[PDB]
Amino acid sequence: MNWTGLYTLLSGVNRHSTAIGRVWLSVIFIFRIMVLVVAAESVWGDEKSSFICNTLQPGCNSVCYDQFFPISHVRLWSLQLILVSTPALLVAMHVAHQQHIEKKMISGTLWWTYVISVVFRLLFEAVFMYVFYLLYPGYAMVRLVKCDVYPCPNTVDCFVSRPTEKTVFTVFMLAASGICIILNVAEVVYLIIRAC
């Protein structure tokens, strides 16, 4: 397990990515993976069970949790990571397939494929950031949430678990996503400039 092997694996051996997409994007991806691993089960592990309301009606806790957390932050970030990494995996499979098909018996199509992949990665990053903004306005979470949904009578006080730790990790993940967006835009601009 040497450094050259890991660097080649993360690069995708597409021979078209510059330093800002081969040395920096991979590092940010590793950072996001590590943060998600260290915060997936320790922080968001008991988001459902430790979440309690101040009522006595059965079934109000579950409906309140589903009302205020349509999809938890960790799962949303996992989906974002998978969809962002999908175009890179597609480009890696494309270049491997091209090497295989030329082995049994080209630059422009690979360049266009890489550019389209970076554009789609940027689009997925922006879409997931916008979805996060829609579902959870603001970067901070509150301890008290007032819920008025059936079967809870009138308005009940539900209490979120670890709002501050989740706020810290939300800040970290949003900063990483913003850095990824900036790097992808810079990579697209640099490729366009070098093409012309």
In this chain, which of 5, 154, 194, 195 binds a second copy, going by CB under 8 A? 154
Among 9, 130, 146, 149, binds a second copy (CB under 8 A): 146
42-81 mask for ligand CLR (x: CB under 6 A)? ----------------------------------------
Number of CB atoms found within 10 A of residue 52's CB: 15
Report d(CA 40, CA 37) in Å as an integer: 5
Q: From the list 9, 19, 27, 37, which residue makes contact with ligand POV (rule: CB under 6 A)?
A: 37
CA pair distance 125, 181, nearest whole angstrom: 6
Question: What one-character DSSP code corresponds to residue 50?
Answer: S
Q: How far is the CB of 80 from ligand CLR (least distance, A)?
A: 12
H-type helices in 69-162, by residue range?
Answer: 73-103, 107-135
Applying CB under 8 A, among 54, 62, 99, 164 the residue interacting with a second copy is 54
DSSP 1: -
Question: How large is the C-alpha radius of gyration of the chain?
Answer: 21
Can you give the binding site for ligand CLR, defined by CB under 6 A?
A: 9-10, 21, 25-26, 29, 85, 88-89
Interface with ligand POV (CB under 6 A): 1-2, 33, 37
